[PDB]
Amino acid sequence: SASALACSAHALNLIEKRTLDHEEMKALNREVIEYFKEHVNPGFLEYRKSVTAGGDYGAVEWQAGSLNTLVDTQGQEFIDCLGGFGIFNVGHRNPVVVSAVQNQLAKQPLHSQELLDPLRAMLAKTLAALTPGKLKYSFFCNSGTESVEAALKLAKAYQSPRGKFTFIATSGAFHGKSLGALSATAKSTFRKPFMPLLPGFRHVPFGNIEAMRTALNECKKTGDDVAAVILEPIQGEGGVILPPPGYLTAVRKLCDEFGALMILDEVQTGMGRTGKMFACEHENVQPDILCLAKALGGGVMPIGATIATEEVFSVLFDNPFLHTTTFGGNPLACAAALATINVLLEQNLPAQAEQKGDMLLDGFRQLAREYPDLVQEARGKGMLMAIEFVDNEIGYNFASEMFRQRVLVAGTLNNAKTIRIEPPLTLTIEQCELVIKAARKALAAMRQQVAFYEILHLPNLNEEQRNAFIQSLKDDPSQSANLLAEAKKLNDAQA
Amino acid sequence: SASALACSAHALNLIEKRTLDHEEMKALNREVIEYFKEHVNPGFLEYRKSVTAGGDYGAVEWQAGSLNTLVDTQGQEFIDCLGGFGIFNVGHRNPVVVSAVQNQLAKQPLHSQELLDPLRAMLAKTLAALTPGKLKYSFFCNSGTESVEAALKLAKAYQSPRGKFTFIATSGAFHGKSLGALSATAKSTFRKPFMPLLPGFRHVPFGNIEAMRTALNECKKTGDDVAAVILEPIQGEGGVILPPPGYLTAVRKLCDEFGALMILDEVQTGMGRTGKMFACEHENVQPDILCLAKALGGGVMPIGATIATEEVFSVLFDNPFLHTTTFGGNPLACAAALATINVLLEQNLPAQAEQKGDMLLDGFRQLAREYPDLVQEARGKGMLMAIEFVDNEIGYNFASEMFRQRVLVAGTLNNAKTIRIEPPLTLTIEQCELVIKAARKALAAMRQQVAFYEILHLPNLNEEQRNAFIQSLKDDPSQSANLLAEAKKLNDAQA
Amino acid sequence: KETQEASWEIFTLPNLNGRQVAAFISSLLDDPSQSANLLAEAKKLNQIQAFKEAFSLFDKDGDGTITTKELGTVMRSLGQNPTEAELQDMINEVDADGNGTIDFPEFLTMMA
Ligand SMILES: [Ca+2]
Ligand SMILES: [Ca+2]
């Protein structure tokens, strides 16, 4: 058809463009839909259809608008309440992060892998200064799942000479999709097609200290002593699930008691999202191993970090090549990360995340009491929030209605009824009120919608008074509640 | 020591600097050695000590010099014959790749993960055009090990409903260090501390078609039918091991016969290094799954890609979230990759790699016959070469002596006697001659050294008869190999 | 193992000939214990030899002593313009024997 050279050349021509005319846009959207269908995954097209209405399923990314907005190929601007599921904590194209990445790009993007690269040392020192307690040594990779892999391998190298092999995770947990991390991840549909996974992985209910104590004690009784416990401080993909106060402290004490390592997965909750730099700081809990990614890249670079105490990390001192990764700790990613830490500390973005989080969650809870027919509950901590609906169809219509009002939201991998709100920490107060209002109009449209369907499906109604009923439903929406009652008032009287 | 804010600020000040005075340089080198010792890994410091002489163990990266040179914090320029173990196929800071990355950085670095990003579609289409046969669908991640993880998960999702679970790899293979990929990787020291790994992984000798046929037939007889065979077309970390002609074709035929999938790991051999775009093109072999990374990033970005036929990749169509990764397919990485494919095709860098590879390997083979006391053999294909020495200490002294002459080389993870030569495909002929001469002076110095030791351990000669020999060796270092001859010519007569 | 590393580090010193490196090698084979100290004074010895060389090239007429004009020649050559009094002060500061010229050690003392 065309050669790879032609395709690449076209792609670079399109990378160099800053805006698109209407016919260039139509051709590009048509192209991207085709190539998604034939070379990426057609399932994605169906998914976005299930969270949109009409051609909304075919919005194509183009450029960052401001710190908190994204602009598609048609110039439509969206407020980003998705934040790349926790990536854009410091907004899109943060000037400081973009600046650092450009400077280091001017010097050297990737390292030789042989000589000492200075930004890896600088970032390791910074992270040692920034992490609680004895967390001292850092290993750098490129993703969250890789960080969890490094955590598991550290735990294994430390505990295998001590006769401990089994790992305890929690139900509803998500720790990545690489096979190692996938053994810890808990969602059935993510795991079943790839079994068998790693042996000796067990799961207990999240937030239930007695269940976990039971698991450790039974594992000790049967000779399957636990090497490590891994958990998120707050389950992001589980639907923003908050553990009871003191749970993390009790888990730390339990691991200390049984001689198991505590691995905290802060891939999503880290870098200021929950109101503090790390969620474990809410209870002043120091794990043995801490996992970071996503937001640590500043929304510019991919990066992951596994920080551990010298006691545990020392298992790699005799053989520094025991665990490595091809691109880990490259100068570009390190520059991004240092820039992000600087931005978060200088603008005190964690505290801002607490304030704006409290405000948005207040709004969402008020909407929750006003719409109990659609919203089950709203929950969150800092700027990691979620709204759980009555069914999945309802939350679907919510995501769609918010997308039509140009506010970006998305579901949670382990919870089909829940929609997450994870906007940048730089979201302004004006945009906070705009998002609350958008949620209100969404819920209103959804209530009028369910009324419209219920009125449409009544079987004991001829066509004329149905046309009158939906006609009135359109012309006076605030009477929605009454007319629906009236509809059934008549649907019963001729049964 | 200091607060995280201070550390970050210092790091950004150092990122913005373009040159260093010597007190700046000395302070920075001292800093990076300290932070490597206390926050990264002290073992690395010891390793570089074993491959250097004096303060050469403490060379710190600073900036790319030219396409094929690296400049440390002291202004010393090195010819890069390491290429990041296959990363810098198109050189350091390739203007085209840097340009594309800069433009897309101006537009948007990371995607929302919800809307359609166009460069993912463009890159998937380009890779479909560039890959042999029915390879059609691409999954994008951030590293080689992640690409291998995606390959394994594709094979599992395809073969588990067909009752096949076991995987066959080869000894001496390297496929990554994440637990999934590590189950396929073959080096004992990399695997033992993290066992148990994935069940049902077996290894056969590389290049031995009858051994592999035996493994498949026995697995079928016992009901442990093989889901997939995974191998590198040429083993990189094994010491650049070349299979017999027709091996890849026979492996494809065998997989077709038993109904197993063929997974080709081209993380190292891909992107033109072996004289063609992919090593599998030497025999016109199309695998079911192809793994790419390293060089696909153009030496600017981290990226990985798993390409598969629609037949196998279709296992992700019903549920597009069955396998994902946080940063995979981000616009920066895609821009880098497209720029790299463009550069490779427009400058026909594969063919250049064949020519320059033939030249360098000719030089190395001539040095090999001139120095059989130190070199066992030199091997290679395209610009993926290696020199295997008699001992590990010998190859160590070679790496050190080449580093002293400001030519970068490094060892191979699975082969302690072998030093790899993996320079950029953009290496100039002048630099080819320079590296050949550097290798010559290295081997000369090493012969002088081994002679100097061997003269010291000869038993049958008096305490002063040696000192004449050492003396003559040092102030008149010309009688060298022939001198060692004299030494033994007296030792065996005095026996 | 370390006796060998010592043996090669002493062997590779640029400013020693075979006779002394060989003598030292003897001292090290007889004593693996007196290494890093023997190694230390050997390294130092290299420093003295190279210092000797440079000094020799600072004695233009090769007569083994350095005068104010030879000094002067080097000082003027390095872009400077010393006066007679400055040169005399420099020599006077280290002139242990008061003969007005610089011998071998006194030059080492100037450097110290
Ligand atoms: Ca004189
Ligand atoms: Ca005197």
Residue numbers in the entry:
A (entry chain A), B (entry chain B): 7 to 501
C (entry chain F): 107 to 218
Paper text:
To design amino acid sequences that can stabilize the alpha helical structure of the fusion sites, we superimposed one or two turns of terminal alpha helices of connecting proteins using a molecular graphics program. Our method does not require complicated computer calculations for the design process and can be used for the assembly of artificial protein complexes with predictable and rigid structures.
To produce protein complexes useful for cryo-EM analysis, we designed a large tetrameric protein complex. The E. coli putrescine aminotransferase, YgjG, was chosen for this purpose. The crystal structure of YgjG shows that it forms a homotetramer, with each monomeric subunit containing 460 amino acids. The protein A-ZpA963 heterodimer was chosen as the linker connecting YgjG and the target protein. As a test case, we used a calmodulin domain with molecular weight of ~10 kDa as the target protein. For protein assembly, the N-terminal helix of the protein A domain was connected to the C-terminal helix of YgjG by superimposing ten amino acids. ZpA963 and the calmodulin domain were also connected by a helix fusion by superimposing eight amino acids.
